[PDB]
């Protein structure tokens, strides 16, 4: 809409560049997390996220992954590609949206909003790849975790947040 009140007032692009009204997720627990551009998903975060999905997929937990190139201070070897460098694919169970920036000038309105969560307690810049956010059924930012917190460690909060 126009009054950033909830995460549901936001619409984002999916991998297909098609609009997705986040408002369709109400009633479900949103676990928002920024993923890397790397092409391979080697990181352990994905595996653990899959499990989390495997377990709470049909219970209200929806994982919203967002590719971001603002980190991964890669050690180049043939990366110089400005016409097709971002991974042209993301093989995972949960949904992977269009690549967006989480920090800086062109930051996504959503992350801007996720950052106002809990009176600015969540106001920090996304520290690195895989920062985790938990949103309740009403679209309010409930929790935030550092990249270094494996998805599996968010189970207790996921569980509670679902009333299971």
């Amino acid at each position: 809409s126009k009054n950033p009140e909830s995460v549901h007032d936001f619409t984002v692009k999916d991998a297909k560049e098609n609009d997705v009204d986040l408002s369709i997720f109400k009633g479900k627990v949103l676990l928002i997390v920024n993923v890397a551009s790397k092409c391979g998903m080697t990181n352990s975060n994905y595996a653990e996220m899959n499990q989390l999905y495997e377990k709470y997929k049909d219970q209200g937990l929806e994982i919203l992954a967002f590719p971001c190139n603002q980190f991964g201070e890669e050690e180049p070897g043939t990366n110089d590609q400005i016409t097709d460098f971002v991974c042209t694919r993301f093989k995972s169970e949960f949904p992977i949206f269009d690549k967006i920036d989480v920090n800086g000038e062109n930051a996504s309105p959503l992350y801007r909003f996720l950052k106002l969560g809990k009176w600015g307690i969540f106001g920090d810049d996304i520290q690195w790849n895989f920062a985790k956010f938990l949103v309740n059924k009403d679209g309010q930012v409930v929790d935030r975790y550092y990249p270094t917190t494996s998805p599996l460690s968010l189970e207790r909060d996921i569980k509670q947040l679902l009333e299971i």
Copy 2:
């Protein structure tokens, strides 16, 4: 080893101003929490850490709680009162240390070091009362949590560090 390599390379004052070398904690997993400076163990965090402690003190978990008045020092109807500006008494099984600054020009050297953790991923200033850090048996910072993350939600990582 002039320049600190670990949390063990720091000496802090305890509630009774007696120097404490963090080396006496080597071989133990540490939960470092900054607490409100005012009196009152009513905040939910206390009960949860209390529980955490009762269930892990005798397994390798130590809790270093540091009082700080940098957050909402304007809370008590009568806070203005300068006779110290930190509660003269903090009933708790787990040790409460002397007051320290966590942010700014007088931030405790220990908090400067913890903010160095994970290649700067933990560089953010302490957001509010009750931010959490998990340090391994070796004295290196391995996790950081937002104030909003309840203690009990750190159990998985604790067990993982204590190896259980």
